[PDB]
Amino acid sequence: MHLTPEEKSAVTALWGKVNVDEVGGEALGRLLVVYPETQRFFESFGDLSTPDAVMGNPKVKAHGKKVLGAFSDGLAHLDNLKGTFATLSELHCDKLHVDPENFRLLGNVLVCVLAHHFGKEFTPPVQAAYQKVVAGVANALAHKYH
């Protein structure tokens, strides 16, 4: 992961203003509404039939916070993404059977949500930096698939 010093600054700077609880909720929620194929992994979450059922679902909000906290771990270890996500990778592969293409969908829904929340502040150069990070996290989540 080729992250220059400026990109890292920009990224980190940015993350420090993120309310993780909420952004996670929104991110996971929009993933299930915009790309309904990813609902097949969460049948135990109950009602997912409309946008309001999804976005306000308490199990969706709790899971989203969980995903985003892990995402948080990654940003604290940008120079060792593979090590940090190694056990999560094996989990998503061996136990959950998630096609890694789904990791890219989520990565991009997150970029959209950061842009939604920060508007102006989310400039092109800042988006470019976050796109490297989400690609990095998706590649690291994918590495132990076998």
Binding site: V34, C112, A115, H116, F118
Partner: protein, 138 residues
Amino acid sequence: VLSPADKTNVKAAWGKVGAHAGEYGAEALERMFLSFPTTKTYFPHFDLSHGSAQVKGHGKKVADALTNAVAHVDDMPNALSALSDLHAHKLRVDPVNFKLLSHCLLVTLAAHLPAEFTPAVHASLDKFLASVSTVLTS
């Protein structure tokens, strides 16, 4: 497919874009070039610097094409015909690149339309951009 609800969402969102469409198209292209550098290979005869007028000029044309697609939401394959011959047969733009531009438009719209970019509308726009991409690539 675009459902009725989807069409409504799209009309109402592009509606609110109004006169700022050209600037959004322009921002969307800059976002794409910076975040996904491989896309620049299709524009080696452009000046791709920040503020470039060639880029502003091009952003405007992309947004007019999208406006027209919305105006003819029930016959996009025929309304976008000329643009499909250009992209798929003259320029031969690989389909993945459409996904990258679409994503960049969504980011632009989200960054500028806080109150209208709800989950439902976001799903609708995404579907519309996919439909525009399928036409342009077929």
